[PDB]
Amino acid sequence: PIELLPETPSQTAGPYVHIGLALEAAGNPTRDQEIWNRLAKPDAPGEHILLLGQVYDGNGHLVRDSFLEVWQADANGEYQDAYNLENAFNSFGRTATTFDAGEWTLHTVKPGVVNNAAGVPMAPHINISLFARGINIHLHTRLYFDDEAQANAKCPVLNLIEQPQRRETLIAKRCEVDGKTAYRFDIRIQGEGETVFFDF
Amino acid sequence: PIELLPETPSQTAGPYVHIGLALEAAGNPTRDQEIWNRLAKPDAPGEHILLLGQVYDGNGHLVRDSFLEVWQADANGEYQDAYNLENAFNSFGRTATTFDAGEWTLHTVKPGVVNNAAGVPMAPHINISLFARGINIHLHTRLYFDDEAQANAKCPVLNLIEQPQRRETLIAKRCEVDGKTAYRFDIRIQGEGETVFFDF
Amino acid sequence: PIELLPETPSQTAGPYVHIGLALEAAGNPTRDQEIWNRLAKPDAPGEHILLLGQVYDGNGHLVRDSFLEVWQADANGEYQDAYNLENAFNSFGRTATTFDAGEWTLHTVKPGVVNNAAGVPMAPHINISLFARGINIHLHTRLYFDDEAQANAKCPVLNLIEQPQRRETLIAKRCEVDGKTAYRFDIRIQGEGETVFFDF
Amino acid sequence: PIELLPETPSQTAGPYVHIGLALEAAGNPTRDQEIWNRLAKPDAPGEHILLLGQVYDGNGHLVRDSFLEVWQADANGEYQDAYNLENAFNSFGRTATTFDAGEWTLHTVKPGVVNNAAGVPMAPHINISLFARGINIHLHTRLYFDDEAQANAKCPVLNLIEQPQRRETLIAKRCEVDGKTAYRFDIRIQGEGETVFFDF
Amino acid sequence: PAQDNSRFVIRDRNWHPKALTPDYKTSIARSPRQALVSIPQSISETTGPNFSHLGFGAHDHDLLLNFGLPIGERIIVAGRVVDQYGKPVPNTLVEMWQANAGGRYRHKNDRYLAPLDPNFGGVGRCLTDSDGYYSFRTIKPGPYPWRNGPNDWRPAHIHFGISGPSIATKLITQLYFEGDPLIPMCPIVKSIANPEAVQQLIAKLDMNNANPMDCLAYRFDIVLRGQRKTHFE
Amino acid sequence: PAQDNSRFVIRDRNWHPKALTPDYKTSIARSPRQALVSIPQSISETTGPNFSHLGFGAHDHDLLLNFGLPIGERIIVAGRVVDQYGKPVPNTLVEMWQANAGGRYRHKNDRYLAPLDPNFGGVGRCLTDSDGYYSFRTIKPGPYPWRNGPNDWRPAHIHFGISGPSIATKLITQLYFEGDPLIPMCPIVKSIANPEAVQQLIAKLDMNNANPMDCLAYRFDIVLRGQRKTHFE
Amino acid sequence: PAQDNSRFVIRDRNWHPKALTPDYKTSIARSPRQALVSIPQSISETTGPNFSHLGFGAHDHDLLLNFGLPIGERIIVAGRVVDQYGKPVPNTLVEMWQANAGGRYRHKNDRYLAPLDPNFGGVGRCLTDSDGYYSFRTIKPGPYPWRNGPNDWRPAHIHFGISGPSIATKLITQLYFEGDPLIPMCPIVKSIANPEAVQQLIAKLDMNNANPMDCLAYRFDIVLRGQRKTHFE
């Protein structure tokens, strides 16, 4: 068969990822422009929401050194690739969990519906990549919302998970924080209620 | 780099370890001098105590063919390496689990405090090595006492275990047997409450 | 380590170099345009000078088949790389030693000062490459002027030569030929007073 | 044949040898006890002399970064191996040439006569080892005195040098410095008057 | 906005390290037990951020100046980012972090006894050029001990993050230095089953790029997932 | 009392058999799932009992008399105990146990149909001398079937226990006999991943140590962890 | 006083670098043109100073303390001094000097741009013990450019000076570090014609002597000329 060049092999980020990708957290001076956890400026169109979660290891212990990257469509269901701190909305962000409490937070807007390759619409979702010490190659998952049940029922992606019980691991639970619409999305790396992770 | 001679590889003790290191148990005649479970003679200085426990496998079943070795300082926190049946106290001992009940016992004294290489005191502890069928290489652990919480909280060794819930697996629970001071130390080889095993 | 394609290997020019690069000298018909020893036209700005010299071998014998290439800045200390027979000044020239007298001559102007990479001024000098039969790979050297002592004392290149006595080998002695300003620069390939040769 | 373990290969001392073996000269703080250029204290028996010299390279240029070690007998022709700063006399010493003047000096006494392996007397001499940048393996030589012509003429070592003119290279010339008896010993590493160097 | 025009060659999960690699202790409790679910590529996975307009500082990529001069071996780390089809990946984001000359990281959690270097930070970023090239100026990091086995030492390395054209191509890896004896003993390195794959992570000494009498140079090229046009879709 | 004056070379856990080795059925339920926690060496770990003054009986090391003569192959099992540096380990306790010639152990739980031997016990102990030498006199044990796979048989072996200078050095192993065809088929033996390590467990026929017209001999040297003095600690 | 009691095996001047090695530029003008004169060994050459009574400071051998802590890779450099016959050389003087972690030397003549380290001198001395063992505690020196060819860089190295029992054994050498890619490119290293001889100068990584969580260790054994008793003289 035909073989192309092999992709460069992945390596864990280690415990000090923060010094490189999350300066503040490393407890170090930051640069003029940093890629952080605020995708939307308050003047951005769409429903402003706060996302928060904890990451657990197979023993049910908090993973206090995780790093997360998110990719999502804007409110119209459009992916905004041109990253600029001037933009009201950026499709990309980064967050990490507290060395203390161990919770990450993200400030964005509820993404709009996007069609799959076959023209079938997918339920609103946030694409997430998880990085950390002990994770050789990052984990891919999706955050869906519990208040989009109608949509979730028909998602061609969610429909790909054989067992209905597993689909629920992908559904963030709506709440409110300081009077703001928040969604809690805990990731269980292993064991009971282990989160669905994808390959694409 | 520099390579030394390789250490001889470990092998499981097997189910018949008793004929070799626990004669009585094998149900065989013993020799004049044997290394057994009585570290201290009644006239030995320090607080006399009874140690007892059970060993569980990964399915929650009792491991009835287990063999144990202990190493501990005397009441003055001094290691008495000169093994002699005439001594009032021996720092070293051996025990095994009953084919019926599956419980092991030891007659000793609560150990004195010893300092680590850096001069820091360690909490009173008993060094344990566990051998049995199914166990390729012996497992090392330590037995701490629940009534030494102050010392325990400051142990440079206990402090090396990352997860606090994991530290609790090393703490023996004080009790009384026939009105005698005893401590119970159960070992969970696998699964829920799995005991911390060390490498050194 | 990273290895690039290897440079094509040098080879001596041989005794007949003239037929290819010094037609006149080869005593053959020249072509319309030829590259020779007149870098400056009468009306080229700067102090017009005559450069002359001889080349000596290890035995103190004259080298009568030498081919030289020179590169120098103009009176303004500027390098004129667009070679043209029309130019009043060309930064490049070629000359050779007479099969008889064995002396080469070049008609040029005294070069202006140029800065080294670090921003330090180098004394006025002419870059020469000497080719000839017996020379596998061409020798690189520099011609400095005796009447620029002050500058000479400070040249970053000249001061790179460890022993002061060796520096003197690079200084041309001013003279007058037909009431014209000249400078003589003899090259000693080997031995007593061997001329400093560079690697770059 | 029988081959033993090969000796560790020698390497040049390089230019910073002083830091390591001539502290003062590196211009660094010295330690309590240093091995230096004063082999005899004023009350040492024998005739107190001053030794001095320069070292030349193949070009007749001064080697200003040379390091020298000396080994000699006392006034009684005795080798004192037990090195001690308390001693009235030490047979071992070290010296180096000035970064400026480039002249080395030594304060000792004229060595008594010692016999060779065959029981034959050698003329009073001082054993020298020369080290420096550009020298891959140290050079061994001997210093003899011009005022010992009789002894010199019968020296079994001096006599090994085929050519008489070469022996001259090893004879120090008597002088007086501050009304003190001194001998000058110049080393010429290469070329005209090249000093004799040994292999042993 | 982003367009679903591309498809990315499927990842070889046997080339990359697996999640469960017990010698690397922390991987035990941090690896999934269920199989990953494969999903068809959609616009969601085939698009990603473009950092062409991030406001990079003048010494973003110069660790000698971006924090006195640091103590340590002055080097340049350079290379190119290409895809599996060998096509350059222009204007892509390259991020790196590392320890000082002594293996000490400027991070609160680093308690190693090697001291901090008053003139050294350890962070850099660079956007590849039209040809997929990048370069950084820094000091070679030192190895350091870590709590894995009782005597584990990481080989000297630089941590790297690369974005690429989409989130399907984004990768975090580690650069190792040619000849380092610590390489083959590392459980993290060995998380990779194929020794051929390990070779891709070793930066080669590059004398051609060095600055004579100043600093040495290392060459590190990166290969991202092959990008192709959709067809007969 | 004992003093903290030594350090022991860290164990190579890739050399030794791993805990989880599925072909050896009982290891499934009897292996940890969490990683071992590495600790610095202290007086606790670097000290151990000295058996110098134990009262050893006259035939402690002679299985031919310590229990008529037993039926089976009369053999001498001897060797030396050294550290990884090659330094002898004097006055150290060596303990052993084995089955009879038919593969039957003198243990209540053994119901293998091969009969017991009225003159054979199967236990021995020996304190190594000034040069690290130990020696035992016994009979060569037979192989025996065990409940693993439907047709699993243990190669003939002698179980060994050795003390060394500290608890850090304490080891339990098995000796196998040179050329036994059952060796490479055993799941317990195979628990050891490197065939090179396997070789260390095979006692070699030692014709030089044999007693003509009496008994054969086998040589089995044991290597304990390297002992070194602490420096710059 | 000293006594002419021994002979030293003749030096192999094809093993050691020759005097004239033109790639190493300075050697051209500082190498003799005449042949060395061989002379028989006498008391003059077979004796030497004994440094046993030199008053050595407490940190004479600890470069970490003899000059804050220095910046760089903490390592122990240890080994043994033996003669060609494999006999240890006790109470012998071992002296060393090296650059700091950046390749900077504490010498007036060093103008390389890497900065000095306020806590590092770079000089040590140690008297070998009864077994010929020496050890130093220092930081790993960095490579540095030098004026030879236009892009020449010395591999990281430590300068060594060993006394031995006499002036005949006295030696000055350099230690190189295992795997350094710079080694095969060095004109000085290359002054040594035989690759096998080059290997003797390469210090090996010694994980067994390392202080876990503290410092690495390198092993450098030194072979001095064999010493024998005179016979039939």
Ligand SMILES: O=C(O)c1ccc(O)c(I)c1
């Ligand atoms: O402490 C650790 O586990 C640790 C530290 C640094 C680093 O780069 C890695 I990967 C792991």
Ligand SMILES: O=C(O)c1ccc(O)c(I)c1
């Ligand atoms: O019956 C078993 O499983 C069994 C018996 C003896 C023995 O030495 C071993 I290892 C295992």
Ligand SMILES: O=C(O)c1ccc(O)c(I)c1
């Ligand atoms: O005569 C000679 O030396 C000679 C002639 C022709 C040629 O190409 C060469 I090179 C040398």
Ligand SMILES: O=C(O)c1ccc(O)c(I)c1
């Ligand atoms: O400058 C030089 O030539 C130089 C410097 C240091 C050193 O160790 C050596 I060898 C040579």
Ligand SMILES: O=C(O)c1ccc(O)c(I)c1
């Ligand atoms: O990759 C593996 O080894 C792996 C994956 C999933 C799983 O549940 C187990 I157990 C092992």
Ligand SMILES: O=C(O)c1ccc(O)c(I)c1
């Ligand atoms: O060593 C192994 O294979 C191993 C270790 C731990 C663990 O939890 C698992 I699943 C496998």
Ligand SMILES: O=C(O)c1ccc(O)c(I)c1
């Ligand atoms: O070793 C050599 O190459 C060597 C020695 C002496 C000498 O005069 C010359 I020319 C070369």
Ligand SMILES: [Fe+3]
């Ligand atoms: Fe058995």
Ligand SMILES: [Fe+3]
């Ligand atoms: Fe030709």
Ligand SMILES: [Fe+3]
């Ligand atoms: Fe790291």
Ligand SMILES: [Fe+3]
């Ligand atoms: Fe040097």
